[PDB]
């Protein structure tokens, strides 16, 4: 599970911008509610459990939400 | 008026709506988001 | 992040908010964004305008208020 070998600063800025679209209130975390809001804009209707599954696979410290370090770590990983 | 329009254009750029519309067309949300930034 | 703002930056962002809040009702709507964008030579679709509101509409009430505008402005410095 390494992050992508070539991770540019501009890709990191895009990760911050993407994070800010989920964390709209700017408290530095993404909740299941904030994730559901964005995915309902996408045309998906996930359940409260499906949302918790997607949070859980990004949530490295198990505190129930996603912070930017967790988001960035997962994003640069999927960047491969 | 010119000062106001410059401020407006700068703030509108802050929405990055082209980048955001790219995500929406692409939409496993996090994998698909990786593709847009890829 | 909005707390890390100087007096001058808040005063500036307050002035900027009023440029978009055309009717002075304390909210920015899709229609007000559209009016400004078209005055600058952009021609967004209604869907794009709603996406723009949705980007920063943290409380989901359907418009941008000054707290949300300040959060946007502060985090993008
Ligand atoms: Ca949040
Ligand atoms: Ca966490
Ligand atoms: Ca208004
Ligand atoms: Ca709002």
Curated annotation (Swiss-Prot), chain B:
Location(s) in or outside the cell: Cell membrane; Cell projection, Rhabdomere membrane
Superkingdom per UniProt: Eukaryota
Post-translational events: Phosphorylated by inaC.
Tissue specificity annotation: Expressed predominantly in the rhabdomeres of photoreceptor cells. Expressed in the third antennal segment and in the olfactory segment at approximately 70 hours after puparium formation during antennal development.
Positions in coiled-coil regions: none
Function of the protein: A light-sensitive calcium channel that is required for inositide-mediated Ca(2+) entry in the retina during phospholipase C (PLC)-mediated phototransduction. Ca(2+) influx may then feed back and inhibit PLC, thereby facilitating phosphatidylinositol 4,5 bisphosphate (PIP2) recycling. Trp and trpl act together in the light response, though it is unclear whether as heteromultimers or as distinct units, and are activated by fatty acids and metabolic stress. Also required for olfactory adaptation and may be involved in olfactory system development.
Subunit structure and binding partners: The C-terminus interacts with a PDZ domain of inaD to form the core of the inaD signaling complex. Other members of the complex include norpA (PLC), inaC (PKC), and possibly trpl, ninaC, Fkbp59, calmodulin and rhodopsin. Forms homomultimers and heteromultimers with trpl. Interaction with trpl is mediated in part by the N-terminal region and the transmembrane domains. Also interacts, though to a lower extent, with Trpgamma.
Family: Belongs to the transient receptor (TC 1.A.4) family. STrpC subfamily.
Protein name: Transient receptor potential protein
Organism expressing this protein natively: Drosophila melanogaster (Fruit fly)
Portion of the parent chain present: 801 to 845 of 1275
């Amino acid at each position: 599970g390494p992050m992508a070998d070539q991770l540019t600063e501009e890709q990191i800025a895009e990760f911050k911008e993407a994070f800010s679209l989920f964390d709209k209130d700017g408290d530095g975390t993404i909740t299941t509610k904030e994730l559901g809001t964005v995915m309902r804009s996408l045309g998906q209707n996930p359940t409260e459990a499906e949302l918790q599954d997607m949070i859980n696979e990004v949530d490295a410290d198990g505190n129930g939400t996603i912070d930017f370090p967790e988001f960035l770590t997962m994003m640069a990983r999927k960047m491969k | 008026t010119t000062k106001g329009k410059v401020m407006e254009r700068r703030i509108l750029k802050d929405f990055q709506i082209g980048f955001v519309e790219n995500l929406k067309q692409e939409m496993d949300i996090f994998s698909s988001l990786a593709k847009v930034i890829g």
